[PDB]
Write a protein that binds this ligand. Sequence first.
Ligand SMILES: Cc1ccc(N)cc1C(=O)N[C@H](C)c1cccc2ccccc12
Ligand SMILES: [Cl-]
Ligand SMILES: [Cl-]
Ligand SMILES: [Zn+2]
Length: 317
Amino acid sequence: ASMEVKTIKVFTTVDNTNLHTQLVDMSMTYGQQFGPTYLDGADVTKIKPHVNHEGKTFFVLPSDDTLRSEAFEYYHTLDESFLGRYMSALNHTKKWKFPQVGGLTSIKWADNNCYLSSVLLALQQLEVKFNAPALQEAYYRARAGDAANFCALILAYSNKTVGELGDVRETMTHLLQHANLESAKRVLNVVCKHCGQKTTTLTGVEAVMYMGTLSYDNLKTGVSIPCVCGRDATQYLVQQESSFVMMSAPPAEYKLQQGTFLCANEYTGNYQCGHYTHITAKETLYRIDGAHLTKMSEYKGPVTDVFYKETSYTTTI
Ligand SMILES: Cc1ccc(N)cc1C(=O)N[C@H](C)c1cccc2ccccc12
Ligand SMILES: [Cl-]
Ligand SMILES: [Cl-]
Ligand SMILES: [Zn+2]
């Protein structure tokens, strides 16, 4: 338009909470004035300002102490490439569909996001709290059906990109590290027939996840494990302090009886290239597969993860 000095008022941010007013020179690009810049996850580093941009909020990278501090307080990470991978992933997740299925927010399949849909579904049924404000907020919105952000954060925290199939268990591990499980505790009694006995105590994420069996009952009765030497020593739960536990194991035909578990995940296909679907229950058993739901009276299939509700448990040994 009118050839003259033109500068518009926009806002820059790293957490979308603290907004920094900026007067930009329309005669140059965002990159030249802010460095890598984003608008709704879309990279606009190489373009110049538009009047349509007045009053809009742009994401930039932590280029100064204030920004570094703000980004850290919000996301709780020091990974320099975090903000970038997040915007990059959000640029895609914002196009996904998040239908309500069985009363839970699910995700229409796209880009092998079935493992993310399983994670999201599981979370909504667990008493779990995040410490990173970034996740508290995005999670709150996902429960209402607007999970584009929450999905992008999960991808960024577990350092995966849109398109690649991930492992639910492993993804929960990365994710739960930013949850409040500071009071989660597990005490295991190990007994090697030969070399006596000891007691192992796990806390945080390690206190709620187990790999080997899908049965929480077995963990309580005893499960074998390779000893320093000799055979496989026995091990069993003595104390459990958490709002839930997750029992994992390689997919295998398993029967799931309603009332005996919280929710679970089945996986069909080959290692790293199969398909996940979520199993839960309300009035009956529900099989949630993205935007698909199937109600059944009984279930038996390839299960890898089973969640159980917990408060506090102690042995009768
Ligand atoms: C989807 C995915 C992405 C990344 C990585 N690293 C792993 C997986 C993955 O295949 N996980 C499933 C549940 C799995 C785990 C353990 C043993 C399994 C044996 C046979 C078939 C599946 C098996
Ligand atoms: Cl939360
Ligand atoms: Cl349960
Ligand atoms: Zn031994």
